[PDB]
From a paper:
To structurally verify the proposal for the inhibition of p110γ and p101 expression, we co‐crystallized 1, 2 and 12 with [name]. 12 is covalently bound to Pro1 in the middle of its structure and as a result occupies more of the pocket compared to 1 and 2. Because of this higher occupancy of the active site, 12 may stabilize better the conformation of the active site than 1 and 2, resulting in no disruption of [name] interactions with its receptor. In crystal packing, [name]:12 complexes revealed two trimers in a repeating three‐dimensional unit (or asymmetric unit), so each [name] trimer structure was analysed. The phenol ring of Tyr36 was moved from the original position (magenta) as shown in 1‐bound structure to a slightly open position (green) in 2‐bound structure, and to the fully open position (light pink) in 12‐bound structure. Apo‐[name] and [name]:12 complexes exhibit B‐factors under 5 Å2 for L2 loop, indicating low flexibility and possibly stable interactions with receptors. [name]:12 shows high B‐factors only for L1 and this also suggests that L1 may not be critical for receptor binding. 12 increased the flexibility of L1, whereas other inhibitors did not. Thus, it is likely that 12 disrupts L1 interaction with either CXCR2 or CXCR4 and is also responsible for the partial inhibition of p110γ expression. In contrast, 12 did not significantly inhibit neutrophil recruitment.
[name] ([name]) is expressed at high levels in various inflammatory diseases and cancer. [name] promotes directional cell migration (or chemotaxis) of various cell types 2, 3, 4. Unlike canonical cytokines and chemokines, a trimeric [name] molecule has three tautomerase active sites at the trimer interfaces 23. Although the enzymatic activity is vestigial, there is accumulating evidence that the active site is important for receptor binding 24, 25.
Author numbering:
A (entry chain A), B (entry chain B), C (entry chain C): 2 to 115
Protein backbone atom coordinates (compact mmCIF):
# COMPACT_ATOMS: atom_id res chain seq x y z
CA UNK A 1 0.00 0.00 0.00
CA UNK A 2 0.21 3.70 -0.95
CA UNK A 3 -1.54 6.72 0.46
CA UNK A 4 -1.78 10.14 -1.19
CA UNK A 5 -3.23 13.32 0.27
CA UNK A 6 -3.88 16.43 -1.76
CA UNK A 7 -4.84 19.50 0.34
CA UNK A 8 -5.17 23.27 0.29
CA UNK A 9 -3.56 23.30 3.73
CA UNK A 10 -0.13 25.11 3.37
CA UNK A 11 3.14 23.34 3.53
CA UNK A 12 4.19 24.86 6.88
CA UNK A 13 1.02 23.48 8.60
CA UNK A 14 2.27 19.93 7.78
CA UNK A 15 4.05 18.68 10.93
CA UNK A 16 7.50 17.22 10.70
CA UNK A 17 6.83 13.58 11.47
CA UNK A 18 3.63 13.46 9.40
CA UNK A 19 4.88 11.13 6.62
CA UNK A 20 6.48 8.87 9.15
CA UNK A 21 3.26 8.85 11.33
CA UNK A 22 1.17 7.96 8.21
CA UNK A 23 3.56 5.15 7.36
CA UNK A 24 3.40 3.62 10.86
CA UNK A 25 -0.40 3.94 11.21
CA UNK A 26 -0.99 2.46 7.79
CA UNK A 27 1.25 -0.46 8.64
CA UNK A 28 -0.81 -1.14 11.69
CA UNK A 29 -4.13 -0.70 9.90
CA UNK A 30 -3.26 -2.73 6.76
CA UNK A 31 -0.96 -5.32 8.39
CA UNK A 32 1.63 -4.59 5.64
CA UNK A 33 5.33 -3.95 6.44
CA UNK A 34 6.15 -0.26 6.91
CA UNK A 35 9.28 -0.61 4.71
CA UNK A 36 6.96 -1.18 1.64
CA UNK A 37 4.46 1.58 2.38
CA UNK A 38 4.50 4.76 0.29
CA UNK A 39 3.03 8.08 1.35
CA UNK A 40 2.69 11.31 -0.49
CA UNK A 41 1.44 14.68 0.73
CA UNK A 42 0.67 17.56 -1.59
CA UNK A 43 -0.02 20.78 0.12
CA UNK A 44 -0.87 24.28 -1.04
CA UNK A 45 -3.35 23.06 -3.65
CA UNK A 46 -5.94 25.08 -5.51
CA UNK A 47 -9.09 23.27 -4.53
CA UNK A 48 -12.59 23.71 -3.24
CA UNK A 49 -15.03 21.49 -1.46
CA UNK A 50 -18.65 22.48 -1.75
CA UNK A 51 -17.57 25.77 -3.36
CA UNK A 52 -15.66 26.76 -0.27
CA UNK A 53 -11.87 27.04 0.32
CA UNK A 54 -11.72 26.22 4.01
CA UNK A 55 -9.26 23.32 4.64
CA UNK A 56 -10.16 20.16 2.67
CA UNK A 57 -8.44 17.02 1.30
CA UNK A 58 -8.76 14.60 -1.63
CA UNK A 59 -6.98 11.40 -0.97
CA UNK A 60 -6.36 7.89 -2.18
CA UNK A 61 -5.40 4.51 -0.72
CA UNK A 62 -4.27 1.80 -3.06
CA UNK A 63 -3.68 -1.68 -1.78
CA UNK A 64 -3.36 -5.19 -3.14
CA UNK A 65 -6.18 -6.60 -1.05
CA UNK A 66 -7.12 -5.41 2.45
CA UNK A 67 -9.84 -3.29 0.75
CA UNK A 68 -13.58 -3.83 1.42
CA UNK A 69 -16.66 -2.49 3.17
CA UNK A 70 -15.66 -2.81 6.87
CA UNK A 71 -11.93 -2.26 6.36
CA UNK A 72 -12.56 0.96 4.38
CA UNK A 73 -14.76 2.29 7.16
CA UNK A 74 -11.89 1.82 9.70
CA UNK A 75 -9.40 3.33 7.31
CA UNK A 76 -11.64 6.35 6.86
CA UNK A 77 -11.95 6.83 10.62
CA UNK A 78 -8.19 6.49 11.13
CA UNK A 79 -7.29 8.71 8.23
CA UNK A 80 -9.86 11.43 8.77
CA UNK A 81 -8.73 11.33 12.42
CA UNK A 82 -5.12 12.02 11.39
CA UNK A 83 -6.11 14.73 8.99
CA UNK A 84 -8.32 16.41 11.67
CA UNK A 85 -5.68 16.24 14.38
CA UNK A 86 -2.51 17.01 12.33
CA UNK A 87 -3.73 19.26 9.51
CA UNK A 88 -6.90 20.66 11.19
CA UNK A 89 -9.08 19.49 8.33
CA UNK A 90 -12.71 18.72 9.20
CA UNK A 91 -13.74 15.06 8.39
CA UNK A 92 -16.69 16.20 6.29
CA UNK A 93 -14.19 17.95 3.97
CA UNK A 94 -12.14 14.89 3.12
CA UNK A 95 -12.73 12.36 0.33
CA UNK A 96 -10.69 9.16 0.16
CA UNK A 97 -10.87 6.92 -2.89
CA UNK A 98 -10.05 3.25 -2.15
CA UNK A 99 -8.58 1.06 -4.88
CA UNK A 100 -8.21 -2.71 -4.55
CA UNK A 101 -5.36 -3.31 -6.96
CA UNK A 102 -4.67 -6.65 -8.70
CA UNK A 103 -1.06 -7.75 -8.04
CA UNK A 104 -0.55 -8.02 -11.85
CA UNK A 105 -1.42 -4.31 -12.11
CA UNK A 106 1.15 -3.07 -9.67
CA UNK A 107 4.66 -2.34 -10.94
CA UNK A 108 7.67 -2.37 -8.66
CA UNK A 109 11.42 -2.98 -9.05
CA UNK A 110 11.37 -3.67 -12.82
CA UNK A 111 8.46 -6.15 -12.57
CA UNK A 112 5.07 -6.52 -10.93
CA UNK A 113 3.57 -8.41 -7.99
CA UNK A 114 2.33 -11.35 -10.13
CA UNK B 1 -18.39 13.82 -7.15
CA UNK B 2 -14.87 15.16 -7.58
CA UNK B 3 -13.13 16.70 -10.55
CA UNK B 4 -9.41 17.22 -10.90
CA UNK B 5 -7.52 18.96 -13.75
CA UNK B 6 -3.76 18.93 -14.20
CA UNK B 7 -2.53 21.29 -16.86
CA UNK B 8 0.61 22.97 -18.14
CA UNK B 9 -1.26 26.29 -18.43
CA UNK B 10 0.06 28.83 -15.84
CA UNK B 11 -1.84 29.65 -12.64
CA UNK B 12 -2.31 33.24 -13.87
CA UNK B 13 -4.36 31.93 -16.81
CA UNK B 14 -6.74 30.22 -14.43
CA UNK B 15 -9.51 32.82 -14.08
CA UNK B 16 -10.72 33.89 -10.64
CA UNK B 17 -14.08 32.15 -10.23
CA UNK B 18 -13.02 29.07 -12.18
CA UNK B 19 -13.35 26.74 -9.15
CA UNK B 20 -16.83 28.19 -8.36
CA UNK B 21 -17.81 27.82 -12.01
CA UNK B 22 -16.70 24.16 -12.11
CA UNK B 23 -18.61 23.51 -8.84
CA UNK B 24 -21.85 24.98 -10.14
CA UNK B 25 -21.57 23.41 -13.59
CA UNK B 26 -20.82 19.97 -12.15
CA UNK B 27 -23.68 20.31 -9.69
CA UNK B 28 -26.05 20.91 -12.62
CA UNK B 29 -24.51 18.19 -14.79
CA UNK B 30 -24.34 15.49 -12.08
CA UNK B 31 -27.49 16.57 -10.20
CA UNK B 32 -25.54 16.29 -6.89
CA UNK B 33 -25.75 18.89 -4.20
CA UNK B 34 -23.17 21.67 -4.63
CA UNK B 35 -21.97 21.49 -1.07
CA UNK B 36 -20.57 17.91 -1.78
CA UNK B 37 -18.79 18.67 -5.08
CA UNK B 38 -15.01 18.85 -4.83
CA UNK B 39 -12.81 20.51 -7.48
CA UNK B 40 -9.09 20.64 -7.82
CA UNK B 41 -6.96 22.47 -10.39
CA UNK B 42 -3.30 21.89 -10.76
CA UNK B 43 -1.62 24.40 -13.08
CA UNK B 44 2.03 24.92 -14.18
CA UNK B 45 2.63 21.23 -14.73
CA UNK B 46 5.43 19.70 -16.73
CA UNK B 47 3.51 17.74 -19.29
CA UNK B 48 3.12 16.87 -22.94
CA UNK B 49 0.38 15.53 -25.21
CA UNK B 50 1.48 13.89 -28.43
CA UNK B 51 5.08 14.93 -27.77
CA UNK B 52 4.05 18.67 -27.94
CA UNK B 53 3.80 20.96 -24.90
CA UNK B 54 1.24 23.34 -26.26
CA UNK B 55 -1.64 23.81 -23.70
CA UNK B 56 -3.08 20.47 -22.55
CA UNK B 57 -4.93 18.82 -19.65
CA UNK B 58 -5.21 15.47 -17.88
CA UNK B 59 -8.32 15.29 -15.75
CA UNK B 60 -10.39 12.92 -13.58
CA UNK B 61 -14.04 12.72 -12.57
CA UNK B 62 -15.02 10.34 -9.85
CA UNK B 63 -18.65 9.74 -8.92
CA UNK B 64 -20.74 7.14 -7.16
CA UNK B 65 -22.92 6.32 -10.17
CA UNK B 66 -24.07 8.89 -12.80
CA UNK B 67 -21.13 7.48 -14.88
CA UNK B 68 -21.80 5.78 -18.24
CA UNK B 69 -21.62 5.94 -21.97
CA UNK B 70 -23.86 8.82 -22.92
CA UNK B 71 -23.43 10.65 -19.63
CA UNK B 72 -19.65 10.58 -20.01
CA UNK B 73 -19.81 12.02 -23.50
CA UNK B 74 -22.02 14.82 -22.12
CA UNK B 75 -19.57 15.50 -19.24
CA UNK B 76 -16.76 15.69 -21.76
CA UNK B 77 -18.52 18.23 -23.85
CA UNK B 78 -19.24 20.32 -20.80
CA UNK B 79 -15.79 20.06 -19.36
CA UNK B 80 -13.79 20.42 -22.55
CA UNK B 81 -15.92 23.54 -23.36
CA UNK B 82 -14.97 25.03 -19.96
CA UNK B 83 -11.28 24.20 -20.46
CA UNK B 84 -11.34 25.65 -23.96
CA UNK B 85 -13.22 28.82 -23.05
CA UNK B 86 -11.50 29.47 -19.71
CA UNK B 87 -7.97 28.14 -19.91
CA UNK B 88 -7.68 28.14 -23.81
CA UNK B 89 -6.94 24.42 -24.06
CA UNK B 90 -7.96 22.78 -27.24
CA UNK B 91 -10.40 19.90 -26.62
CA UNK B 92 -8.27 17.47 -28.60
CA UNK B 93 -5.42 17.97 -26.01
CA UNK B 94 -7.57 16.99 -22.98
CA UNK B 95 -8.09 13.57 -21.44
CA UNK B 96 -10.70 12.95 -18.74
CA UNK B 97 -10.60 9.61 -16.95
CA UNK B 98 -14.06 8.64 -15.57
CA UNK B 99 -14.37 6.46 -12.46
CA UNK B 100 -17.62 4.98 -11.26
CA UNK B 101 -16.76 4.39 -7.61
CA UNK B 102 -18.50 1.82 -5.45
CA UNK B 103 -20.03 3.60 -2.45
CA UNK B 104 -18.07 1.29 -0.13
CA UNK B 105 -14.75 2.48 -1.80
CA UNK B 106 -15.32 6.16 -1.02
CA UNK B 107 -14.35 7.50 2.37
CA UNK B 108 -15.86 10.65 3.80
CA UNK B 109 -16.71 12.02 7.28
CA UNK B 110 -14.98 9.13 9.15
CA UNK B 111 -16.88 6.39 7.27
CA UNK B 112 -17.92 5.46 3.76
CA UNK B 113 -21.02 5.99 1.66
CA UNK B 114 -22.06 2.44 2.18
CA UNK C 1 -2.11 5.97 -23.12
CA UNK C 2 -1.08 8.39 -20.33
CA UNK C 3 1.83 8.11 -17.95
CA UNK C 4 2.27 10.18 -14.80
CA UNK C 5 5.29 10.21 -12.53
CA UNK C 6 5.32 11.78 -9.07
CA UNK C 7 8.72 12.08 -7.41
CA UNK C 8 10.75 13.77 -4.73
CA UNK C 9 13.63 14.27 -7.19
CA UNK C 10 14.11 17.96 -7.80
CA UNK C 11 13.01 19.74 -10.93
CA UNK C 12 16.55 20.65 -12.02
CA UNK C 13 17.35 16.92 -12.01
CA UNK C 14 14.68 16.15 -14.69
CA UNK C 15 16.61 16.28 -17.98
CA UNK C 16 15.46 18.29 -20.96
CA UNK C 17 14.18 15.74 -23.40
CA UNK C 18 12.67 13.52 -20.68
CA UNK C 19 9.00 13.98 -21.70
CA UNK C 20 9.88 13.33 -25.39
CA UNK C 21 11.84 10.25 -24.46
CA UNK C 22 8.93 8.95 -22.40
CA UNK C 23 6.62 9.67 -25.29
CA UNK C 24 8.71 7.86 -27.80
CA UNK C 25 9.41 4.88 -25.59
CA UNK C 26 5.73 4.49 -24.65
CA UNK C 27 4.80 4.60 -28.41
CA UNK C 28 7.27 1.74 -28.97
CA UNK C 29 6.08 -0.26 -25.95
CA UNK C 30 2.33 0.16 -26.32
CA UNK C 31 2.31 0.26 -30.17
CA UNK C 32 -0.05 3.32 -30.05
CA UNK C 33 0.42 6.42 -32.13
CA UNK C 34 2.69 8.99 -30.49
CA UNK C 35 0.12 11.76 -31.06
CA UNK C 36 -2.23 10.15 -28.47
CA UNK C 37 0.37 9.64 -25.75
CA UNK C 38 0.26 12.01 -22.74
CA UNK C 39 3.12 12.23 -20.20
CA UNK C 40 3.28 14.16 -16.96
CA UNK C 41 6.18 14.54 -14.50
CA UNK C 42 5.72 16.13 -11.03
CA UNK C 43 9.06 16.73 -9.30
CA UNK C 44 9.92 18.12 -5.79
CA UNK C 45 7.10 16.17 -4.06
CA UNK C 46 6.89 15.52 -0.34
CA UNK C 47 6.91 11.75 -0.24
CA UNK C 48 8.40 8.71 1.48
CA UNK C 49 8.87 5.10 0.48
CA UNK C 50 9.32 2.64 3.40
CA UNK C 51 9.63 5.58 5.70
CA UNK C 52 12.77 6.91 3.83
CA UNK C 53 12.95 10.16 1.77
CA UNK C 54 15.69 8.88 -0.57
CA UNK C 55 14.69 9.32 -4.24
CA UNK C 56 11.41 7.55 -5.01
CA UNK C 57 8.41 7.71 -7.44
CA UNK C 58 4.72 6.85 -7.58
CA UNK C 59 3.47 6.44 -11.07
CA UNK C 60 0.49 5.49 -13.15
CA UNK C 61 -0.07 4.19 -16.65
CA UNK C 62 -3.59 4.27 -18.02
CA UNK C 63 -4.31 2.57 -21.33
CA UNK C 64 -7.41 1.38 -23.23
CA UNK C 65 -6.24 -2.24 -23.43
CA UNK C 66 -2.58 -3.29 -23.79
CA UNK C 67 -2.61 -3.92 -19.94
CA UNK C 68 -1.99 -7.46 -18.73
CA UNK C 69 0.35 -9.75 -16.77
CA UNK C 70 3.25 -9.91 -19.18
CA UNK C 71 2.76 -6.48 -20.71
CA UNK C 72 2.81 -4.80 -17.29
CA UNK C 73 6.00 -6.60 -16.35
CA UNK C 74 7.52 -5.38 -19.57
CA UNK C 75 6.32 -1.76 -19.00
CA UNK C 76 7.70 -1.83 -15.42
CA UNK C 77 11.17 -2.81 -16.67
CA UNK C 78 11.11 -0.14 -19.29
CA UNK C 79 9.82 2.68 -17.09
CA UNK C 80 11.89 1.76 -13.99
CA UNK C 81 14.95 1.67 -16.30
CA UNK C 82 14.17 5.19 -17.53
CA UNK C 83 13.58 6.44 -14.02
CA UNK C 84 16.85 4.89 -12.85
CA UNK C 85 18.88 6.20 -15.76
CA UNK C 86 17.41 9.67 -16.08
CA UNK C 87 16.26 10.58 -12.57
CA UNK C 88 18.55 8.30 -10.55
CA UNK C 89 15.67 6.61 -8.73
CA UNK C 90 16.30 3.07 -7.63
CA UNK C 91 13.67 0.64 -9.13
CA UNK C 92 12.91 -0.78 -5.72
CA UNK C 93 11.61 2.67 -4.69
CA UNK C 94 9.16 2.97 -7.61
CA UNK C 95 5.45 1.90 -7.66
CA UNK C 96 3.53 2.00 -10.94
CA UNK C 97 -0.25 1.50 -10.89
CA UNK C 98 -1.67 0.07 -14.15
CA UNK C 99 -5.26 0.90 -15.25
CA UNK C 100 -7.01 -0.77 -18.12
CA UNK C 101 -9.60 1.86 -19.00
CA UNK C 102 -12.88 1.18 -20.74
CA UNK C 103 -13.05 3.36 -23.85
CA UNK C 104 -16.40 4.66 -22.62
CA UNK C 105 -14.61 6.05 -19.52
CA UNK C 106 -11.95 8.06 -21.41
CA UNK C 107 -13.07 11.57 -22.36
CA UNK C 108 -11.25 13.35 -25.24
CA UNK C 109 -12.20 16.14 -27.70
CA UNK C 110 -15.74 16.86 -26.42
CA UNK C 111 -16.71 13.24 -26.26
CA UNK C 112 -15.27 9.84 -25.25
CA UNK C 113 -13.79 6.98 -27.21
CA UNK C 114 -17.04 4.94 -26.98
Amino acid sequence: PMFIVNTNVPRASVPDGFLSELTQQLAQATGKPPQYIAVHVVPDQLMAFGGSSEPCALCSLHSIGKIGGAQNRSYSKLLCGLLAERLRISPDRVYINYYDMNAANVGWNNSTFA
